[PDB]
Design a protein around this ligand. Structure first.
Ligand SMILES: CN(C)c1ccc(C(=O)NCCCCCCC(=O)NO)cc1
Ligand SMILES: [K+]
Ligand SMILES: [K+]
Ligand SMILES: [Zn+2]
Length: 357
């Protein structure tokens, strides 16, 4: 009946090790700990993933080359946006096992919600790293939930299209991917238009909501609550894996959307009401303080509590300047979403789910 918090000091430093987001894991955890929220959660320790577990999705050829480089790289998407340097394999197996360990607790009824903020490594392909993703925990997690639940619902709210996890299941009707991501020519990963719905018997079991810059809480929530509505009808999920990349929150260097944790929180709330087993994953998020703010606040809405507007003193208190509060203010800039286009989409989707048996 109580939330599982996947954590272990050995795991958090493992994470901070990634150059792309140094010390983010600590800041996130630390801030949550400073809010004394880990005292209201079953702190479960993460279990590293075994080769036969990472193999349930990633090809052995990839997992080998990944194991070696960690020991021609361009072969498996390794190089620039995927630093083929130190021992990443370990790092990857840790996060993977973290999400699988989370998935497990969900089946063993050990909880109703399992959290692993260091996860949501959604761009990864079966045999190719991508967008700084070397392993796909989200997928490895859904595949594990498949042991019980016959129907999983994946909701990616990261700023980018969860292309990786969608391709993985783009052919089955057993799993449904729903991604709300900024979509525009020349913005990673490029895919994810609304016309994108899947292939074969997976046709219509993949949802994509292309959005534009400047979108803000109310507008965003109404689009999400809406889509999730039709989706909860048509698909009727058994479990839910939710990606919450905070690189949509005002102030992200990404500077695209204009959300604040509250807006995301309402979406989160709506989903937590279906009272289904839910696996919580993080994602993007490159304004460390803001991300920690977002996810701590979100851990709060998961625990039903309302957090103190003031930022408790902890190891990273200094990074919350200049105001030192938990609230994030939207930016004074245009919301380039035309209300008519949002509808053409909501429709196209509203009418595409129509086909779900
Ligand atoms: C030094 N600097 C400011 C940058 C260097 C590289 C990129 C990039 O590769 N961008 C394309 C891939 C972005 C992947 C983001 C991962 C994510 O949040 N996925 O959801 C961008 C900025
Ligand atoms: K699918
Ligand atoms: K998304
Ligand atoms: Zn992202």
């Amino acid at each position: 009946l109580v939330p599982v918090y996947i954590y272990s000091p050995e795991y958090v430093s493992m994470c901070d090790s990634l150059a792309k987001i140094p010390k983010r894991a600590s800041m996130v955890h630390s801030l949550i700990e400073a809010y004394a929220l880990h005292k209201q959660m079953r702190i479960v320790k993460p279990k590293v993933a075994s080769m036969e577990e990472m193999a349930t999705f990633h090809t052995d050829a990839y997992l080998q080359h990944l194991q070696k480089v960690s020991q021609d790289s361009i072969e498996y998407g390794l190089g620039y946006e995927c630093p083929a340097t130190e021992g990443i394999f370990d790092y990857a197996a840790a996060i993977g096992g973290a999400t699988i360990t989370a998935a497990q607790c969900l089946i063993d009824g050990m909880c109703k919600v399992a959290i692993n903020w260091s996860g949501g490594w959604h761009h990864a392909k079966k045999d190719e790293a991508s967008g700084f993703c070397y392993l796909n925990d989200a997928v490895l997690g859904i595949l594990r939930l498949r042991r019980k639940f016959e129907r999983i619902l994946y909701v990616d709210l990261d700023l980018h299209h969860g292309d990786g996890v969608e391709d993985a299941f783009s052919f089955t009707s057993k799993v449904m991917t729903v991604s709300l991501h900024k979509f525009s020519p020349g913005f990673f990963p490029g895919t994810g238009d609304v016309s994108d719905v899947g292939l074969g018997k997976g046709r219509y079991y993949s949802v994509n909501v292309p959005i534009q810059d400047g979108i803000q809480d109310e507008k965003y929530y109404q689009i999400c609550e809406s889509v999730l509505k039709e989706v909860y009808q048509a698909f009727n999920p058994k479990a839910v894996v939710l990606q919450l990349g905070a690189d949509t929150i005002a102030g992200d260097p990404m500077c695209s959307f204009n959300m604040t944790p509250v807006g995301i929180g309402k979406c989160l709330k709506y989903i937590l009401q279906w009272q289904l087993a839910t696996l919580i994953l993080g994602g993007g998020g490159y304004n460390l303080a803001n991300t920690a703010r977002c996810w701590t606040y979100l851990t709060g809405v998961i625990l039903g509590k309302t957090l103190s507007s003031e930022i408790p003193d902890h190891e990273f208190f200094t990074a919350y300047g200049p105001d030192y509060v938990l609230e994030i203010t939207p930016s004074c800039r245009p919301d380039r979403n035309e209300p008519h286009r949002i509808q053409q989409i909501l429709n196209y989707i509203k009418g595409n789910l129509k086909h779900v048996v």
